[PDB]
C-alpha cells in the first residue's frame, strides 16, 4: 500500500496472509469468506511464463494478523491448505482476465475478535455500490513505494496498511493502458487533477477491495487486487477482479466441493 496508513487492530478481520514455507516470505494477500474458504488472485499461485506453480504443500495461510513479521501467538491462526481451485478460463497469456482462485482450508477456523468473514455481494448491492466516484478500501502488507534506496529507504510496512480509493469510469480505465481490459475488471484510484494519491503495490495482490453498505452496515468484497503498471503512477489506475461477475463460479466450487 502506497500513501496509506496503519490499520487499527481488528479493522480488517477478514484479511489473510499467504505465506510461503521455504523460503519464508510474504506471497500475496487474500480474504476469509467462510470458516473454510479463502479467496485470492489466481496469479498469486499460477503463472507459467515464470514457471510459478504453487501447491497445497508449498504454502501456509495466516489469519488474524496485525504485524507483518511477528508470530502473534495469542491472536493469529495458521492453517494448511486442503485444495486450490483456479478459474478454468483464467487468462494469464494476455490480460489476467478472471484473476481469481479459491482455497479450501484443511480444518475450519474458529472466529474471534480478530478473525471474521467478509460478505460477498448480491445483484442489488453490486448494482448500487459499483459506481464511478464511490470509494472502496484496500488493505495489505505490500510495499510502501514502487522503488526505494537499498538498505536505507523504507521499504515494507511493519503493520497492516489501509488506503481508500475511488472507482473510476470505464472509459478512463480503457484510455490509461494498452492492455485489453474486460468486463471482469474494474479500475480505481485518484485522477492526476485530484490532489490525493494511493495504490496497492507488490505484495498487496490477492487482497480485498471492500465497500460498506450504509443501509445494513455490512462490508462487501467487491474486488480483488489484480494488476497495474507500477505503483501510484500519475495517469495510471489499479485494476481489480470483479467479484460479482464471477460469483457463479465461486458458487459452483463451494457447492460441489
Amino acid at each position: 500500500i502506497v500513501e496509506g496508513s496503519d490499520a487499527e487492530i481488528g479493522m480488517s478481520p477478514w484479511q489473510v496472509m499467504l505465506f510461503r514455507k521455504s523460503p519464508q516470505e510474504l506471497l500475496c494477500g487474500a480474504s476469509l469468506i467462510s470458516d473454510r474458504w479463502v479467496l485470492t488472485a489466481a496469479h498469486c499461485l499460477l503463472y507459467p511464463p515464470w514457471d510459478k506453480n504453487f501447491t497445497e504443500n508449498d504454502l501456509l495461510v495466516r489469519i488474524g494478523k496485525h504485524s507483518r513479521t511477528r508470530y502473534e501467538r495469542n491472536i493469529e491462526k495458521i492453517s494448511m491448505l486442503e485444495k486450490i481451485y483456479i478459474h478454468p478460463r483464467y487468462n494469464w497469456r494476455e490480460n489476467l482476465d478472471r484473476d481469481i482462485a479459491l482455497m479450501k482450508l484443511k480444518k475450519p477456523v474458529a472466529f474471534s475478535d480478530y478473525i471474521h468473514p467478509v460478505c460477498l455481494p448480491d445483484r442489488e448491492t453490486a448494482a448500487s455500490l459499483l459506481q464511478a466516484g464511490y470509494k472502496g478500501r484496500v488493505t495489505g502488507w505490500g510495499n510502501l513505494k514502487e522503488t526505494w534506496t537499498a538498505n536505507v529507504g523504507k521499504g515494507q510496512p511493519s503493520v497492516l496498511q489501509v488506503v481508500n480509493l475511488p472507482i473510476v469510469e470505464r472509459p478512463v480505465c480503457k484510455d490509461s493502458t494498452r492492455i485489453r481490459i474486460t468486463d471482469n475488471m474494474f479500475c480505481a484510484g485518484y485522477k492526476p487533477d485530484e490532489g490525493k494519491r494511493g495504490d496497492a503495490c507488490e505484495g498487496d495482490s490477492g487482497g480485498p477491495f471492500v465497500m460498506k453498505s450504509p443501509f445494513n452496515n455490512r462490508w462487501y468484497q467487491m474486488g480483488i487486487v489484480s494488476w497495474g503498471e507500477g505503483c501510484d503512477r500519475d495517469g495510471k489506475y489499479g485494476f481489480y477482479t470483479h467479484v460479482f461477475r464471477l460469483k457463479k463460479w465461486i458458487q459452483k466450487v463451494i457447492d460441489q466441493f
Binding site: 514455507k21 521455504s22 519464508q24 501456509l60 513479521t69 511477528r70 508470530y71 495458521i78 494448511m80
Partner: peptide, 11 residues
C-alpha cells in the same frame, strides 16, 4: 525478518 513460527507447520 519473520519471527519463527512452530516448525510443526514448516513440516
Amino acid at each position: 525478518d519473520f519471527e519463527e513460527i512452530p516448525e510443526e507447520y514448516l513440516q
